[PDB]
Amino acid sequence: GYCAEKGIKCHNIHCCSGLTCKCKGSSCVCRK
């Protein structure tokens, strides 16, 4: 039960508070 931080890519996990698991095209990075 954890979350990814800013810049920490994620496959099926969501970014911690303040960040959101955004994916633009074929990339996946935690963006505000």
Swiss-Prot record:
Q: In which tissues is it expressed?
A: Expressed by the venom gland.
Q: Tell where it localizes.
A: Secreted
Cystines in this chain: C3-C16, C10-C21, C15-C30, C23-C28
Q: What is known of its domains?
A: The presence of a 'disulfide through disulfide knot' structurally defines this protein as a knottin.
Q: Which family does it belong to?
A: Belongs to the neurotoxin 33 family.
Q: What is this protein called?
A: U4-agatoxin-Ao1a
